[PDB]
Symmetry: D3
């Protein structure tokens, strides 16, 4: 109970602060859907491109999945930073 | 004219691809508004907290603006990665 | 009260989980002290090197403060990631 | 022998500089132990949670190992930056 | 046709701008070759070190491939940033 | 003297290893020149665009210098990672 007070640096937060943190998380959920949609497109692209070695080689050289992964991480890490700015913890 | 064909690795893109790239950019615009809103909150917080050295010191230790900045960069860099996954260029 | 339950994705945490999160934060505090110590060294180095244009130019080309800053951010962002691994939130 | 003088930008270092670089590396070793401990916890959590599909799905959605990995990289990259600030090389 | 005008924020570019963007991409190609060369060295090192458990353990602890991967990503992401600085898009 | 042996994790290196590390550093020097050239272009662009508020606002919204800075850091951090892969230190 009241876990936050047991965590170093965590401070009591206003409703306004929580609302903002929650908004960032909600916008992120919309990004997640987009990321899933891109993944779906890539999977279809690979399937449709089966038997075209030349296109398969192009997809492999492009590395689209790695790039989608790099992006997800970035969106997520960024969300955490905006949330940290709102939360303003007292620890390093 | 047709600048893209003058850029190494850039390839002709489908409408479907452009639509997706544009969607990422549009979602990012929504993040930009949120980022601006957080900045506004922080500015107000500083103003209201003027004359409370203790709170001003807390805000300074928290470094909220640096964190908002780190987040913007991350959201933006990530967007570029998702776009790269959609665009699939032919260059390293 | 019970702010966490008002935040999307946050889940009830065990004492064991909190202890671990707190340990990461404590180790980070030790890094903060080191970072401050390096900053102190750099400041002294600049002072002692005043009137040696050649050394001042060397420090400026090296960009030590930027590098210390890049490191602090990295240590901190990493701490957040380990904490996220321990906390295991239910949101993206 | 004297490899450093064969590496571009590397410069002769004071004992004080080496001591500081070594301290960062030693603190990092303490982080490594923590990272290993978190990994151990996660492995146990997965084992104990075997046969609870609902919990296994929760762990998978959380992606704790990816997050631990992101953190290790960050701690390590940051250490390198602090070390670079201490070492102050003469190369870009 | 004229895909760029269909992409949000993309703007007409001068030849001078394209030339610079292309130069960054060309320099990156040189990095790609180096990265491939390092990978080749690592593969040879592993082969030659087969049957020396002690050396194999050393390579594994070092994690050279992960580090090469982290570097490729960084070089590439950076290239994109320099290109963004040259291109100057009108979107977030 | 023999500083490297005084640094934790640093190991004796082959000429082949040093040559490769040096090559990465040399390629980086070429990137530095490009980065300086882009900076020069941006400065000229700002000068020539003085008295065109509309263009000045465009440059400011674009944030080209921040982006060049993000890129330099990335190129540099990446170089360090490739070098780490070649050097293979024995420390975390
Ligand atoms: N489930 C859960 N995750 C938490 C809690 N407190 C912090 N975290 C996670 O740890 C991360 C780093 O502190 C947080 O990032 P934010 O963004 O949210 C969040 O993901 C908590 O009470 N519950
Ligand atoms: N204005 C403009 N920016 C471009 C153009 N092509 C690429 N860029 C920018 O360079 C970045 C890296 O290639 C792109 O990231 P994206 O994401 O879009 C985009 O910001 C172009 O034709 N016009
Ligand atoms: N002060 C405070 N900061 C919080 C709270 N919950 C999350 N945060 C901050 O938001 C960050 C991202 O969720 C957290 O990273 P961690 O690491 O801890 C933490 O810094 C809270 O209840 N209080
Ligand atoms: N083993 C070994 N690694 C080195 C040497 N010089 C540099 N490195 C590695 O290359 C990295 C980037 O230059 C260094 O990061 P630091 O942090 O230490 C270190 O890991 C050396 O002489 N021996
Ligand atoms: N193939 C292709 N890739 C593009 C196009 N426009 C942008 N991209 C890719 O999307 C990335 C982010 O916008 C770009 O990074 P730059 O660097 O180039 C580039 O890799 C395009 O017209 N074709
Ligand atoms: N000047 C100098 N810098 C060093 C030395 N050893 C390591 N460094 C710097 O510390 C960084 C992290 O270990 C190195 O990255 P690299 O890449 O080279 C390098 O910049 C040294 O002997 N002299
Ligand atoms: N072939 C591939 N498919 C999907 N993701 C990949 C991949 N290769 C690498 N990745 C992922 O890309 C990020 C940077 O390397 C890492 O993810 P994170 O999450 O960040 C890799 O696992
Ligand atoms: N006091 C401050 N206010 C606002 N932004 C700040 C700041 N100190 C640093 N920053 C910014 O935080 C990022 C990581 O250091 C950098 O921005 P970018 O964009 O990324 C700094 O300029
Ligand atoms: N001269 C300088 N002194 C101190 N910090 C500096 C600096 N120039 C840049 N920085 C900081 O280095 C990081 C990457 O650019 C950013 O900090 P963050 O925090 O990350 C810059 O503000
Ligand atoms: N399921 C998984 N388990 C462990 N590490 C994982 C993982 N998926 C991805 N990673 C790792 O997380 C980082 C960012 O993607 C990369 O590690 P680095 O080291 O950085 C991935 O390999
Ligand atoms: N054993 C390994 N071999 C090669 N690449 C590896 C690896 N373990 C992780 N990686 C890669 O290192 C980056 C950071 O984790 C990610 O690549 P990206 O591309 O970035 C991992 O997939
Ligand atoms: N107006 C500006 N001009 C130049 N560099 C800037 C800038 N605003 C921020 N930066 C720099 O961009 C990186 C990410 O914020 C940081 O540099 P580093 O090096 O990384 C900021 O200082």
């Amino acid at each position: 109970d009241n876990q936050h007070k047991k965590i170093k640096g965590y401070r009591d937060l206003s409703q306004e602060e929580i609302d903002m943190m929650n908004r960032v998380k909600e916008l992120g959920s919309q990004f997640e859907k987009l990321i899933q949609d891109v993944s779906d497109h890539l999977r279809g692209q690979y399937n449709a491109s089966l038997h075209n070695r030349d296109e398969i080689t192009r997809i492999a050289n492009a590395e689209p999945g790695r790039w989608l992964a790099i992006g997800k991480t970035d969106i997520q890490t960024g969300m955490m930073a905006i949330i940290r700015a709102i939360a303003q913890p007292d620890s390093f």
